[PDB]
Amino acid sequence: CENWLALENILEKYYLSAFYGIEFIVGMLGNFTVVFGYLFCMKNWNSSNVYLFNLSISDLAFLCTLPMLIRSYATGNWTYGDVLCISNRYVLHANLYTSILFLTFISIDRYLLMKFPFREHILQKKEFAILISLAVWVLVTLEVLPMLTFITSTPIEKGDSCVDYASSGNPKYSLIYSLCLTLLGFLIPLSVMCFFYYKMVVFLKKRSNKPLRLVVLAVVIFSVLFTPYHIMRNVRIASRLGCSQKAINCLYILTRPLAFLNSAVNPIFYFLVGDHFRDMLFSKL
């Protein structure tokens, strides 16, 4: 399967380098603009602002790993050592699963605000959104911890080893973990946003739009960008239970920067919370 090995090498060296390189540029400029916009324009934060700022911190953590990941794919090996293997493996999964959760909680916030514009409920308080943001970081850190435990069992002390559980280690345990993480990390938050879009549609039909716009964009972005990656991570593991295996790995490589395109485009959500932040950004410039 020398032909498929040539494809794997080219995909890593050229496709991943270029795609992550573009995400690094677009993501850094977009995230630093919205972060500085909040640091200099927003004086009294609500729940949605808290979640959006956390989303940018998650995106920025991921964007900071890209020079290391691009250099590793461009050169064909991991050379950064054990500490940076664990920290990068953490950040990549953490960014993926905190991002959809912050958008899920923003969606619930937009629904509660549609029913209770004056934010009288405890669930609508700024301090409660801070508590939920901290819960999101803790939950996601815990979802990612079995992968880190597995990595610490591999010979990372060698300095040039940083394995992917999708490609290495017991396929039976990697599949159970990958499928549970697909369910809890992806399908469940997506389903919750779908449920709250439906609750929003029903509320507005009774009372007879912007709240619908944010949630619809979130459902579309995550359905389109996360689905190929979650299918291929699971298919990559299942195939390990030949040329077919290398061909599946090539499909899997293709899906990875597509899921992380989310971190470069999700600063758009700052402009969908009805505060005219875009207009506020221009006033300061």
Epitope: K43, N44, N46, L113, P117, F118, G274, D275, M280
Partner: nanobody, 128 residues
């Protein structure tokens, strides 16, 4: 460019009614959202009612079955009809104007923070 003055503040017996007015001075009020807020001594400011430039109205849960917000763009006035007032409604009532007419009423307690146009406030006292 608008200036606001609230009026109608007074003494009400519990269960009594009172109408406040928020009058504007400037070119036009048409494109403005107008929100009514109140602050009791030692308490935080809280929104009570808001009217968008399109005429949509929103009410806080504590005043929903009792207050009515309305506007007359020709007289450039916004009224707050307050019925069944209780001692807990004692506060200085203020009106605020948002030039983004469809913005304020989405999230009045948060979006009030972005506004530069406020009235001086009018005292409403509910005591037996």
């Amino acid at each position: 460019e608008v200036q606001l003055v609230e009026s109608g503040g007074g003494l009400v017996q519990p269960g009594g009614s009172l109408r406040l007015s928020c009058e504007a001075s400037g070119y036009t009020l048409a494109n403005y959202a107008i929100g009514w807020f109140r602050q009791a001594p030692g308490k935080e400011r809280e929104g009570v009612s808001c009217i968008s430039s399109g005429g949509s109205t929103v009410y806080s849960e504590s005043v929903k079955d009792r207050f009515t917000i309305s506007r007359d763009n020709a007289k450039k006035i916004v009224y707050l009809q307050m019925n069944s007032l209780q001692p807990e409604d004692t506060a200085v009532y203020y009106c605020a104007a948002d030039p983004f007419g469809e913005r304020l009423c989405i999230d009045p307690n948060t979006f009030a923070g972005y506004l530069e146009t406020w009235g001086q406030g009018t005292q409403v006292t509910v005591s037996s």
